[PDB]
């Protein structure tokens, strides 16, 4: 309540006598530029809009600026009827009316300010957290409500997850038939799956071209806020050619992550085989479990600081390209810590365990035949439950218990209890969706009921993720995007390898595993070359098909830019006696 748009908190780090001076500078610069800077702090500084006229100029100066960079594409309405018409759109102007240069508190670094965040609208969360908890799919008018608050970068998540949930009803039905009627490893199911994983990619690439155009946000790559942490050396900047000689260093980082995380997973996989040989039994089972659940959360956390100390080398003048180039350096960790402990089961054991059974240095064997099937149960069913309680229930209990040991203006506690909470990142929430797409592409022929396990998940995960933004963490400031970003390029790579891994897995499991038995000459490498090249000419056929059907929300963009230019537009021997005698020459010619 109380018409607050943002708060601005303070750290109290050092000696107060320059901090008296710095408090003026973070307050003089506001009141010279925005209005009604107020504090009933303790320290956090409230901020309002200035007037019902100085705000209306700032909305018009923003609707002009994205127009002439080629986003809005209509004409900007003037300051007479310049109502913001959206709660997220008004909060977006104010944050650009604070964060931008030429105004900055520079909220992360180079000053002494902790965070800037808006306040929740509790009465419209409570009437939606219970509203679409009953429906099985929420409508386009419901998704625009998640756009008119929380910005659009949060809005592309819940529309992706909705469109992911809507297409999962086809493999969940068809995989149910292949489980109940067929057995596993069926040659029909692994073909329909890879044909399914093409259409969902090529539908969503067409779907973003509607939804980033219907929300008037197609082309925001031109309009990105700059990073303060940027070191140019010229003026009207940094040469992009010097990036390529320094982004080339990213490839020795990817070799390092595959060789450091590759060892720790292969070590802890080798030890838990060794209890099947030698073994006290029940005590020693959790010895590889302790080591793998403590080292790769630590070793990956080392590789974040290596990636961060690498990513701040290359300058990346825009804020978006910094977050994208960091995320593409983390997916090589996320590919290798989540798919390697099941590649190493399916492609090492059942090929050969007789070669690696006589090596007894970590102090008769038939293969336990369901080591693979039990392990693909563990992520897609079990870890979807213990991962549900760990991101929603357990941090909700941690924040509730923490307030209980602590215990005209009562909401100054409520703002203070909101200021303690965490801060949402959609990139942290897209990686749990992009990776679990991998198990549906890479390892679905083992136990074909895995799309049923994600169908039940993604209905609940759609609600629990809207739960955690409203009551568990603070409100994200409204951020704009024209796509989900790096993941769409990586959701297509992850279905590439799913065509190689599946069709190689179907051939060996032709009614016998037997870990030197299966032919590889005309069989294994041939069905990889043939299946994967049949993958490519199908996605070439689907992508070239959907590019010929433009959807209506982007057809109304091309027509509307036509009408804009329509309105700015609106602001010597010859003697044959014309044609009546020239035709008389032709009538004379008859032979």
Q: How far is the CB of 146 from Ca ion (least distance, A)?
A: 15
Distance CA 146, CA 242 (A): 41
Q: Does 245 bind a copy of itself (CB under 8 A)?
A: no
Report the sign of the C-alpha dihedral through residues 175, 179, 184, 186, in that order: negative
- Minimum CB separation of residue 491 from ligand CCCCCC in Å reads 13
Under rule CB under 6 A, residue 523 binds ligand 8K6: yes
Residue 520 C-beta: closest distance to ligand 8K6, Å: 9
Min separation Cβ 539 and ligand CCCCCC, Å = 10
- Three-state SS for 6? strand
Residues 6+ apart with CB under 8 A from 255: none
- CB nearer to ligand 8K6: give 187 or 564: 187
Cα 429 to the center of its chain, rounded Å? 7
Q: How far apart are CA 471 and CA 509, in angstroms?
A: 48
Q: How many residues does the chain have?
A: 591
Decide which of ligand CCCCCCCCCC, ligand CCCCCC, Ca ion, none touches 551; Cβ closer than 5 to 8 Å per partner kind. none
Asked whether residue 391 is marked as a ligand-binding residue, the answer is: yes
Question: Bridge partners of 46?
Answer: 7, 38
User: Can residue 188 be called a binding residue for ligand 8K6 (CB under 6 A)?
Assistant: no
Query: Which string of x and - marks every residue 553-572 that binds a copy of itself (by CB under 8 A)?
Result: --------xx--xx-xx-x-
Interaction of residue 526 with ligand 8K6, rule CB under 6 A: yes
| 3 state SS of 149 | coil
Q: Which is nearer to Ca ion, 84 or 451 (CB)?
A: 451
Q: What is the three-state SS of 13-65?
A: CCCHHHHHHHHHHHHHHHHCCCCCCECCCCCEEEECCCCCCHHHHHHHHHHHH
412 counts as binding a copy of itself under rule CB under 8 A:
no
Please name the residues in contact with 537: beta carbons below 8 A apart, sequence gap of 6 or more: none
Nearer to ligand CCCCCC, 46 or 487 (CB): 487
Give Rg (Cα) of the chain: 30
- Pairing state of beta strands 473-474 and 422-423? parallel
Cβ burial 469-483 (10 Å sphere, 16+ → b, else e): bbbbbbbbbbbbbbb
Q: Shortest approach of ligand 8K6 to residue 508 CB, angstroms?
A: 7
**In the complex, what is the shortest distance from the CB of residue 201 to Ca ion, in angstroms, rounded to a whole number?**
22
The Cα 189–Cα 179 span in angstroms is 10
- The residues that touch ligand CCCCCC, with contacts defined as CB under 6 A, are 537, 540
121 known member of a binding site: no
Report in angstroms how near the CB of residue 502 gets to ligand 8K6 at its nearest: 12
Residues 6+ apart with CB under 8 A from 21: none
Q: Rounded to an integer, what distance in angstroms lies between the CA atom of residue 512 and that of residue 526?
A: 19
Does 531 bind ligand CCCCCCCCCCCC (CB under 6 A)? Our answer is yes
Query: Minimal distance in Å, beta carbon 525 to a copy of itself?
Result: 4
Q: Binding residue per annotation — 482?
A: no
Do residues 144 and 85 touch, judged by C-beta distance below 8 A? no
Helices (H) and strands (E) in the chain, counts: 23, 5
Q: How many residues bind ligand CCCCCCCCCCCC (CB under 6 A)?
A: 27
Q: Are 409 and 468 in contact (CB under 8 A)?
A: no
Q: Which residues contact 446 (CB under 8 A, 6 or more apart)?
A: 184, 185, 346, 372, 373, 376, 505
DSSP string for residues in 80-133:
SS----SHHHHHHHHHHHHHS------TTSSSSEEEEE----HHHHHHHHTTTT
Closest contact distance (angstroms) between CB of 506 and ligand CCCCCC is: 22
Q: What is the C-alpha separation between 269 and 277, in angstroms, rounded? A: 14
Partner interacting with residue 526 (select from ligand CCCCCCCCCC, ligand CCCCCC, ligand 8K6, none; CB below 5-8 Å by kind): ligand 8K6
240, 519, 549, 587: residue in contact with ligand 8K6 (rule CB under 6 A) = 519
Residues that bind ligand CCCCCCCCCC (CB under 6 A): 254, 258, 331-332, 335-336, 489-490, 493
Q: In angstroms, what is the minimal distance from the CB of 202 to ligand CCCCCC?
A: 16
Asked whether position 230 contacts ligand CCCCCCCCCCCC by CB under 6 A, the answer is no
- 536 makes contact with ligand CCCCCCCCCCCC (CB under 6 A): yes
Known binding residue 314? Answer is no
The nearer residue to a copy of itself, 49 or 178, going by C-beta atoms, is 49
What is the rounded distance in angstroms from the CA atom of residue 439 to the CA atom of residue 448?
A: 11
Q: What pairs with residue 9 in β-bridges?
A: 44
191 binds ligand CCCCCCCCCCCC (CB under 6 A): yes
Q: Rounded CA gap, 423 and 169, in Å? A: 33
d(CA 400, CA 396): 6
- Give the nearest distance from C-beta 300 to a copy of itself in angstroms: 24
Q: Which of 507, 508, 515, 557 contacts ligand CCCCCCCCCCCC by CB under 6 A?
A: 507
Q: Tell whether 25 is in a known binding site.
A: no
Return residues touching ligand CCCCCCCCCCCC (CB under 6 A): 167, 170, 187, 190-191, 194, 196, 199, 352, 355, 493, 496-497, 499, 503, 506-507, 510, 516, 527, 531, 533-537, 540
Return residues touching a copy of itself (CB under 8 A): 2, 16, 20, 23-24, 27-28, 30-31, 36-39, 41-43, 48, 64, 67-70, 240-241, 243-244, 520-522, 525-526, 528-529, 545, 548-549, 561-562, 565-566, 568-569, 571, 573-574, 576, 578-579, 582-583, 585-587, 589-590
Return residues touching ligand 8K6 (CB under 6 A): 510, 518-519, 522-523, 526-527, 530-531
Q: Which residues are annotated as a binding site for Ca(2+)?
A: 391, 429, 432, 461, 465
């Amino acid at each position: 309540n109380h018409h607050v748009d943002y708060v601005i908190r303070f750290n109290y780090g050092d000696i107060d006598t320059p901090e008296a001076i710095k408090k003026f500078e973070v307050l003089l610069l506001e009141l010279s530029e925005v209005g009604l800077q107020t504090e009933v702090r303790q320290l956090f500084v409230f901020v309002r809009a200035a007037s019902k006229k100085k705000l209306k100029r700032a909305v018009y100066q923003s609707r002009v600026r994205d127009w002439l960079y080629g986003v809005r594409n209509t004409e900007p309405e003037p300051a007479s009827s310049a109502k913001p018409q959206s709660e997220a759109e008004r909060l977006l102007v104010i944050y650009h009316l604070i964060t931008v240069p030429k105004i900055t508190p520079r909220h992360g670094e180079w000053k002494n300010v902790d965070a800037i965040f808006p306040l929740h609208d509790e009465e419209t969360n409570r009437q939606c957290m219970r509203e679409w908890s009953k429906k099985t799919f929420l409508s386009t008018e419901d998704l625009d409500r998640i756009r008119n608050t929380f910005g659009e970068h949060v809005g592309f998540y819940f529309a992706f997850l909705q469109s992911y949930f809507r297409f999962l009803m086809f493999p969940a039905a068809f995989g149910f038939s292949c489980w109940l009627l067929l057995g596993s490893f069926s040659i029909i199911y692994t073909v329909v799956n890879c044909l399914w994983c093409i259409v969902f990619i090529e539908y969503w690439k067409r779907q973003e071209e509607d939804l980033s155009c219907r929300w008037q946000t197609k082309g925001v790559s031109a309009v990105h806020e700059k990073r303060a942490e940027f070191k140019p050396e010229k003026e009207i900047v940094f040469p992009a050619t010097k990036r390529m000689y320094r982004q080339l260093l990213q490839v020795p980082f990817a070799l390092l992550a595959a060789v450091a995380l590759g060892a720790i997973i292969a070590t802890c996989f080798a030890i838990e085989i060794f209890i099947s040989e030698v073994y006290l039994k029940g005590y020693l089972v959790f010895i590889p479990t302790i080591l793998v659940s403590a080292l790769i959360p630590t070793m990956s956390a080392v590789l974040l600081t290596v990636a961060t100390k690498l990513n701040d080398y290359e300058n990346y003048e825009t804020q978006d390209a910094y977050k994208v180039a960091l995320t593409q350096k983390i997916f090589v960790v996320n590919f290798i810590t989540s798919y390697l402990p099941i590649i190493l089961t399916a492609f090492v054991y059942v090929p050969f365990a007789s070669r690696i059974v006589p090596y007894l240095d970590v102090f008769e064997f038939s293969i336990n035949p369901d080591r693979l099937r039990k392990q693909v149960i563990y992520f897609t069913v079990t870890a979807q439950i213990v991962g549900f309680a760990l991101e929603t229930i357990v941090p909700f209990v941690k924040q509730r218990v923490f307030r209980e040991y602590k215990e005209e203006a009562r909401f100054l506690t409520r703002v203070r209890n909101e200021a303690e909470l965490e801060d949402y990142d959609v990139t942290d929430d897209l990686r749990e969706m992009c990776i679990q797409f991998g198990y549906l592409a890479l390892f679905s022929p083992v136990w074909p009921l895995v799309p049923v396990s994600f169908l039940i998940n993604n209905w609940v995960e759609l609600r629990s993720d809207f739960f955690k933004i409203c009551v568990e963490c603070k409100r994200p400031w409204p951020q704009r995007a024209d796509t989900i970003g790096p993941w769409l390029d990586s959701l297509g790579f992850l279905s590439w390898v799913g065509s190689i891994t599946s069709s190689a897995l179907v051939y060996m499991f032709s009614n016998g595993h037997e870990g030197p038995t299966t032919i590889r000459c005309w069989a294994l490498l041939l069905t990889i070359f043939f299946s994967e090249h049949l993958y490519l000419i199908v996605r070439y056929a689907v992508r070239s098909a959907l590019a010929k059907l433009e959807p209506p929300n982007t057809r109304r963009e091309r027509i509307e830019r036509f009408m804009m230019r329509k309105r700015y537009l609106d602001t010597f021997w010859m003697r044959q006696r014309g044609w009546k005698e020239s035709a008389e020459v032709g009538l004379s010619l008859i032979t």
